[PDB]
């Protein structure tokens, strides 16, 4: 019966856990996206972007994946390329975690060394163009199969596990696919007018500055996985009800609290997402509303 | 609806994935116990041992857990003590991973430094006896709630997800609870005469030497999580059909293969368990039999 044909098909069905030391009488529940292959939410889009390029015939036997590693998107693509027998080439800067090196190289990846993150993007492109018929780039910030997998899985899991009671969905934005696809699932396919809340670093609040017509001022920050410093094409502004900003220290402190007080290990961007939800959760406005927060990764 | 009241209740329902480059035409399927809170199988027993001591009244508000950290059992207990509001004290040797230190201390654990693993056991005991009314020791190698949680969850998940077709269950033995409880579920509660296969390091094959009446010769090895060098009280010899030995290098190489060829990240003890299953899987004897292998952890 329920035996997945490869590890890519095992993505998702991640759990909902109620928070005890956050929110107001249990109105904050978290979706633990770390209970995933490759230990992050990115497994969903790594699988679906590979899957869709197969349906497209833009990806076939003997074609080699190339992608600019967005830390976690590289691991997810790596494990999927290995699960489906594709050669893969990832590009990311000159250092990062030497654990991420050993892991990617352990996953059978061919890794490419560039000199920042806009810089790594380049050497992927000149590698793709080095031979356009051997190489496919998936482009995670604009590939519609990124939000589409969330509209098809992440959103519906939230709908089913909350029996339709979900009132607010809180999610940080890196590529924007999670909140776009979730919000699309619940508003458009299920028909409930929830409050979609994007979270971004207060140190780089380009979504807030954009929507307010203010000067867009990207800046350095420590909240890994969100705050790309621009509006991704996979972030559908038309569906964002509200934007919440969080600073790195609060985002970190919140991650520590989730561990010590809830027994939940999550990355700093989950701490940012929880801090934002807790803020909403303690407005009387949201006192009797079920808030669901995405925890995108483990650590 | 499906919202867990704390992280301890979210244990389990881990997935089955068919292996492509192991076994004979798909007869090896793996159970990814790393898709668990705390990223290992031990989450199941950390929860259930805490839960059962609560039912017992051997553990109540204000009592402080003490336990000799078996690497992964410490992390699982840590996250459960935090999820249920217990103070916890774990004992393990003088070094290990300074990441495990930061994680345990991050999980709110009070950590105790001893000078080997039989040595760490001692300072827990003299801490418990330092005040028997404040401290509870759970004793993972002999506590029946360890195999009992596998008879209640792990076994039945295997039964349901294979629609009863599971013929062989392959599992490494540290405390012995996984294979005991699984085998008890399938043989005794469901009534199928499967082949229960224990895996142990060839460098320390005390189960094989015992069952053969030979000299029991424990020895050093690198397969972390199994091979305690003795017969645990939670390992029910009466239910073991077969014992398979695996060396550290093969166990490691197999873990690498699972990553590079299957896209599955698992620890070295999962590599040992897969190597053993692959051996069985390529006996004509087992050619038309579904083999389920426990992958106990991520890394």
Swiss-Prot record, chains A, B:
Cofactor: pyridoxal 5'-phosphate
Sites of N6-(pyridoxal phosphate)lysine modification: 42
First-tier enzyme category under EC: transferase
Any one GO molecular function term: cysteine synthase activity
Domain of life (superkingdom): Bacteria
Binding locations of pyridoxal 5'-phosphate: 72, 174-178, 269
Binding site for hydrogen sulfide: 7, 35, 265
Single biological process term from Gene Ontology: cysteine biosynthetic process from serine
Pathway of action: Amino-acid biosynthesis; L-cysteine biosynthesis; L-cysteine from L-serine: step 2/2
NCBIfam families to which the protein is assigned, alphabetical: cysK, cysKM
Homology family: Belongs to the cysteine synthase/cystathionine beta-synthase family.
SUBUNIT field: Homodimer.
Protein name according to UniProt: Cysteine synthase
Species of the source: Haemophilus influenzae (strain ATCC 51907 / DSM 11121 / KW20 / Rd)
């Amino acid at each position: 019966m329920a035996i997945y044909a490869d590890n890519s098909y095992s993505i998702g069905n991640t759990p909902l856990v109620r928070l005890k030391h956050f929110g107001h009488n249990g109105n904050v529940v978290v979706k633990i996206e770390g209970r995933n292959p490759s230990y992050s939410v990115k497994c969903r889009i790594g699988a679906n972007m590979v899957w869709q390029a197969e349906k497209d015939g833009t990806l076939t036997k003997g074609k080699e994946i190339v992608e600019p590693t967005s830390g976690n998107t590289g691991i997810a693509l790596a494990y999927v390329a290995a699960a489906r027998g594709y050669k893969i080439t990832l590009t990311m800067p000159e250092t990062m975690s030497l654990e991420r090196k050993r892991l990617l190289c352990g996953l059978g990846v061919n890794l490419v060394l560039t000199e920042g993150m806009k810089g790594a993007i380049a050497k992927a492109e000149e590698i793709v163009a080095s031979d356009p018929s051997r190489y496919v780039m998936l482009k995670q910030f604009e590939n519609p199969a990124n939000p589409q997998i969330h509209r098809e899985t992440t959103g519906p899991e939230i709908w089913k596990d909350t029996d339709g009671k979900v009132d607010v969905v809180v999610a940080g934005v890196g590529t924007g696919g999670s909140i776009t696809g979730i919000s699309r699932a619940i508003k458009l396919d299920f028909g409930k007018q929830i409050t979609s809340v994007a979270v971004e670093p207060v140190e780089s609040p380009v979504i807030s500055q954009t929507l307010a017509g203010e000067e867009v001022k990207p800046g350095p920050h420590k909240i890994q996985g969100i705050g790309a410093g621009f509006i991704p094409k996979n972030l559908d502004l038309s569906i964002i009800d509200r934007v919440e900003t969080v600073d790195s220290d609060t985002a970190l402190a919140t991650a520590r609290r989730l561990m010590a007080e809830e027994g939940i290990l999550a990355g700093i961007s989950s701490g940012a997402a929880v801090a934002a939800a807790d803020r909403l959760a303690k407005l009387p406005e949201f006192a009797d509303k079920l808030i669901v927060v995405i925890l995108p990764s483990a650590s």
